[PDB]
């Protein structure tokens, strides 16, 4: 706090067409490490490099819609002089203080836009349109790494949202496969019940877990596995179903307790935590080896390491990655 270096006088250091300056889309890339900013910039290769190292994408085909529509919202356009090629504007999110070199592009997808879309996903699920719910869920899932987010709590929510989309996508995948399988053999019916029981350990909303417990309760009651069916009934009742289903469930329960015997040994452990292999639909019990999706948390039995995750449809099972990046916070 003297007079300073602000007071010291320093060293002063045809027709030629000028050369281009850096474009504002290149400024975006220099100043940002978030995939959505590079996509808005039109730099698809650098965007893909970022998604690859951070979140594990290798099959980018299923990203084409997101990428291209994102690209299209990146620049405004306005005409200067008549009959000459129009100008482009590059709206920045930090526009008040962006200047020449520090800009970084406006935010076009917010986390709550995605949280709102969860509702149409839930409705679609409730009414049974599983193929359309999975499609809508996966879109939310792949969209999360295109977010830009302010604080540590939104990074938390964005992760929970991914986990929600995963839970639904693999659960519904189990149910859709259970419905494609034949129900002729006894051994075939045993396999169906198993899958209905695995679905019971998906972490869904209570209104949906009531439906999957109802499904598991029928199949295990028809199998004559009454000891395990009874506990599905007791768990269904504790979620608080609507009155008609409580009554149908109470009648099935008091019939189970009048004969609390399981007819068959199934491969389903009630008192033992597991994850659902999202490719073969068999349980992986918490100690045993797993390879995971580096973005969603989908679990796979180890045979599948290196393959394309069935949930996200774009990631590499078991790849080691930096982790999701969707905020300036994460670059201290």
């Amino acid at each position: 706090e003297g007079w300073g270096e602000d007071a010291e006088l320093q060293l002063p250091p045809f027709f030629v067409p000028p050369t281009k300056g850096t474009s504002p889309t290149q400024i975006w890339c220099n100043n940002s490490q978030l995939p959505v900013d590079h996509i808005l910039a039109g730099s698809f290769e650098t965007a893909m490099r970022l998604l690859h190292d951070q979140v594990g994408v290798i099959q980018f085909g299923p990203y084409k819609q997101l990428f291209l529509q994102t690209y299209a919202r990146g620049r405004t356009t306005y005409q200067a002089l008549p009959c000459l090629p129009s100008m482009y504007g590059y709206p920045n999110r930090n526009w008040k203080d962006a200047g020449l070199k520090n800009g970084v592009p406006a935010v076009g997808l917010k986390l709550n836009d995605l949280i709102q879309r969860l509702q149409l996903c839930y409705q679609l699920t409730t009414v049974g349109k599983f193929e359309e719910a999975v499609e809508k869920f996966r879109s939310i899932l792949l969209s999360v790494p295109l977010l830009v987010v302010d604080n540590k709590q939104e990074i938390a929510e964005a992760q929970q949202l991914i986990t929600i989309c995963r839970e639904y996508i693999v659960g519904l995948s189990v149910e859709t496969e259970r419905k494609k399988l034949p129900k002729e053999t006894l051994e075939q019916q045993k396999r169906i019940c198993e899958m209905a029981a695995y679905f019971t350990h998906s972490n869904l909303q209570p209104v949906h877990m009531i439906l999957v417990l109802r499904t598991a309760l029928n199949l295990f009651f028809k199998l004559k596995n009454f000891k395990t069916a009874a506990t599905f009934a007791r768990r269904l009742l504790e979620l608080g179903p609507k009155p008609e289903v409580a009554q149908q469930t109470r009648k099935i329960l008091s019939a189970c307790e009048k004969n609390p015997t399981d007819a068959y040994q199934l491969n389903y452990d009630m008192h033992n935590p597991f994850d659902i292999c999202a490719a073969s639909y068999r349980p992986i019990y918490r100690g045993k080896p797993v390879e995971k999706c580096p973005l969603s948390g989908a679990c796979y039995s180890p045979e599948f390491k290196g393959q394309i995750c069935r949930v996200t449809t774009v990631t590499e099972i078991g790849k080691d990655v930096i982790g999701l990046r969707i905020s300036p916070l994460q670059f201290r």
Partner: protein, 292 residues
């Protein structure tokens, strides 16, 4: 005072029909002004894509300034002839040009800009001394992302005539590119010209771009809708609505409608070609991470 003030003003803000109407009414108080009026009359027909008017009515006996508009009309109208016109244009410029004929230099530079040759266009404009020559230089320097050089040429216009329409317009273009506090400056310039004259497609999107830059998407929606009602085919409106749509949370089927609508804008805005290029860049990069 300039007898052609209303005529030139209507043209530069994109009010081409008002230019055409007011050019046909003014009284012939010179032969110098007489030719100057005709130049704007015909450049307005160019701007309306009515190249047949320009091409039929400018004859080999017509004034040199009009020959220059007709040259540009040929290029815009006849895609097959463009490379040969540019070849001849290079030969003219290398041989000898009347430097006082600013109309010829703006028509030369207009052709080069379309031919994606800004060096040639700046080389031509460098030779002229006129306000539109500077204004066109400001625009080209802004496209070259040389906002530093643009500011110096704009400063030239500000010292010569602060209140001129080209100077205001150049101030808005320079401000739209500088950002920050200056975006509001640009907005009011575009607004002030809309509410003295008439709110043309050019001024409507001009204003919308200043809103969108400050993140004020909802304030921009009125302007783009008004522009859409006037002319369903003006491309800059369609592009801006793609941006605005997404920032307002609308469904991707809306962005898709504006993309299909933009293929029939039949005005040659680069956006669709760059979009298809980015379609191809993406398809190519997908196969780089997974060679099927």
């Amino acid at each position: 005072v300039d007898e052609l003030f209303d005529v030139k003003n209507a043209f530069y803000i994109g009010s081409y029909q008002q230019c055409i109407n007011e050019a046909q009414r003014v009284k012939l108080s010179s032969p110098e002004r007489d030719v100057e009026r005709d130049v704007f009359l015909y450049r307005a027909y160019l701007a309306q894509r009515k190249f047949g008017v320009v091409l039929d009515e400018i004859k080999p006996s017509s004034a040199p300034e009009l020959q220059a508009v007709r040259m540009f009309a040929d290029y815009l109208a006849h895609e097959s002839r463009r490379d040969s016109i540019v070849a001849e244009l290079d030969r003219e410029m290398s041989r000898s040009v009347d430097v006082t004929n600013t109309t010829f230099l703006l028509m030369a530079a207009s052709i080069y800009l379309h031919d994606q040759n800004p060096d040639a266009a700046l080389r031509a404009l460098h030779q002229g001394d006129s306000l539109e020559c500077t204004a066109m230089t400001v625009q080209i320097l802004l496209k070259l992302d040389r906002l530093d050089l643009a500011r110096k040429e704009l400063k030239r216009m500000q010292d010569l005539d602060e209140d001129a329409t080209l100077t205001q317009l150049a101030t808005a273009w320079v401000s739209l590119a500088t950002g920050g506090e200056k975006l509001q400056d640009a907005y009011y310039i575009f607004q002030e010209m809309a509410d003295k004259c008439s709110p043309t497609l050019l001024l409507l999107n001009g204003q919308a771009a200043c809103h969108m830059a400050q993140g004020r998407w909802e304030a921009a929606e009125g302007l783009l809708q008004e522009a859409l009602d006037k002319d369903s085919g003006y491309p800059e409106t369609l592009v801006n609505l793609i941006v605005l749509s997404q920032h307002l949370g609308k469904p991707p089927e809306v962005t898709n409608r504006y993309l299909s609508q933009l293929k029939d804008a039949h005005r040659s805005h680069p956006f669709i070609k760059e979009y298809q290029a980015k379609e191809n860049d993406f398809d190519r990069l997908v196969l780089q991470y997974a060679p099927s």
